[PDB]
Ligand binder design. Structure first.
Ligand SMILES: *Cc1c(COP(=O)(O)O)cnc(C)c1O
Ligand SMILES: *Cc1c(COP(=O)(O)O)cnc(C)c1O
Lengths: 288, 319
């Protein structure tokens, strides 16, 4: 695991890509936010598939293996067009698990490149109500139906990212503890968006144990509280993060940065507040 | 710099993206190569612009600042469609240097996305002899002419990646020392492709000082082996960022043992195998490096227990 590791990445040898997961830098965005207070963020784009999903992917596979639910060399299946696919693909490659992915033909082919490159068997499922570039709820229901049919036929382990509790456990045992150590306990708030919610629930649960006075915010597009963010704000702060800090990240990172700056300006926090967010993935994982 | 750093990235705070450069993991590819001997590789794709060019970019900017040649807040310009552009873009963003890039309209628009996202001012220059998707030497010469014209007006610092000796210095002072420490001195051979030649010349020079018995190999595309002295029959290959038809101007034959040739088909095969066996999606030059290192392990030219070290140059996502 990333918790018990004796691995020295700086001055030693890294046994495998699994040891590249977690213990990510916590960077100061001191140029983007020169004060008062400090904006810091976990560089989750420096995980081996360039997203925070390496953590949840690693936990969900590793814990299925430990439980006996997933046997050596046996098949894994997930429904995804996103970062979770790349993460599971990387973990299953190292651990020697055949991995099948279902996703809608609706997705840009670009969404399968990394998964396929890391040895995923990518099944493209016909759209039911959507058109190229628009994957609908019925398009997703169909991808799900294809994966369930394959799972019943093969008895592959279904990762079930949205309902697997080892998703949040990853962040409770790695992300949160790392932030607590890296800040030496100096942190007034944490904030991140929710897809599965693993990152927010796991990290916030751990931080509130160390210090219940830490304000944890969900970033909501268009638990202490929520901060709302527009697509225009996401785009603006994605660009500013690049221009000021030299980090090309995705749109959810734009949103997190824009929410964190609103939170620093609000006066809800002490004048000298240290605010921590997540740089979720690389900007390279997006077309155009 | 990356040499004097007290920064603790694991258990402390990373001041800026500059401190994300170098001290990259040296990974054991023990599944791709289960023995005998060992394949090791620097994860240069975990630099902040996902290429080894963060090192050479950082050195060329930092050393121009130290020399006085580049003043605070003054302009930088480079002719580039490549990983070097992203690296300079990242370094100049942190240090607050306006950065202008020239490149041929011939290049895919995709080649400008990262540079532009990190605040690079991208000037697209009309092709002279090439067509969309085919950038010729005359197309590149034109981009150069546009950058020199702009440089006359603005007096920007010209990075000059193919002629800047601080390119090699980067790898002499970081890459080589890291490999030497991370292996605790156990390395029988080093190998990497050559574009500018910084990585090979710098790393090899340092390793041969620690141990002159370390064999250092250049990875060359089949039919494009200038450094080996062989005639060029195939100018076009898939090893993007390396395998230029000329012996690089920064090349130093005194840290060179031999060349290992690789086909396009081998680059592709080992790019895929690196992904399927190790979970690392890297670029074409990484495919080539892995295929040359495996060929070198299988050859029997080295001891059966040999430790061979190469470079995972960039992410597969940059293509
Ligand atoms: C998964 C993901 C999120 C949200 O993470 P969860 O832990 O699933 O809530 C945010 N941004 C990106 C880019 C993601 O891939
Ligand atoms: C630049 C580059 C090389 C060559 O390294 P040099 O130090 O320029 O010789 C190899 N691979 C990739 C992907 C590069 O970008």
């Amino acid at each position: 695991s990333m918790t018990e590791s004796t691995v020295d990445r700086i001055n030693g040898i890294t046994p495998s890509a699994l040891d590249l997961i977690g213990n990510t830098p916590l960077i100061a965005l001191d140029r983007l936010w020169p004060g008062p207070g400090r904006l810091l963020a976990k560089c989750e784009f420096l995980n081996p598939t360039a997203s925070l999903k390496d953590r949840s992917s690693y936990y969900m596979i590793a814990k299925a293996k430990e439980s006996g639910q997933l046997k050596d060399g046996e098949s894994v299946i997930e429904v995804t067009s996103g970062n979770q696919g790349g993460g599971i693909a990387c973990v299953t490659a190292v651990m020697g698990h055949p991995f099948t992915v279902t996703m809608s033909k609706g997705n840009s082919p670009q969404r399968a490149i990394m998964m396929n490159a890391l040895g995923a068997n990518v099944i493209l499922v016909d759209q039911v109500t959507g058109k190229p570039g628009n994957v609908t709820a019925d398009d997703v229901a169909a991808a799900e139906e294809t994966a369930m049919k394959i799972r019943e036929e093969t008895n592959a382990y279904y990762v079930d990212q949205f309902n697997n509790p080892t998703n949040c456990l990853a962040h409770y045992e790695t992300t949160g503890p790392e932030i607590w150590r890296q800040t030496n306990g100096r942190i007034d708030a944490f904030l991140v968006g929710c897809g599965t919610g693993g990152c927010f629930v796991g990290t916030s649960k751990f931080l509130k144990e160390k210090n219940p006075n830490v304000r944890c915010f969900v970033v909501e597009p268009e638990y202490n509280d929520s901060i709302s963010v527009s697509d225009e704000e996401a785009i603006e702060y994605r660009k500013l993060l690049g221009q000021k800090e030299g980090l090309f990240c995705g749109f959810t990172t734009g949103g997190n940065i824009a929410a964190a700056i609103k939170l620093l300006k609000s006066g809800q926090l002490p004048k000298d507040a240290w605010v921590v967010t997540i740089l979720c993935d690389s900007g390279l994982k997006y077309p155009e």
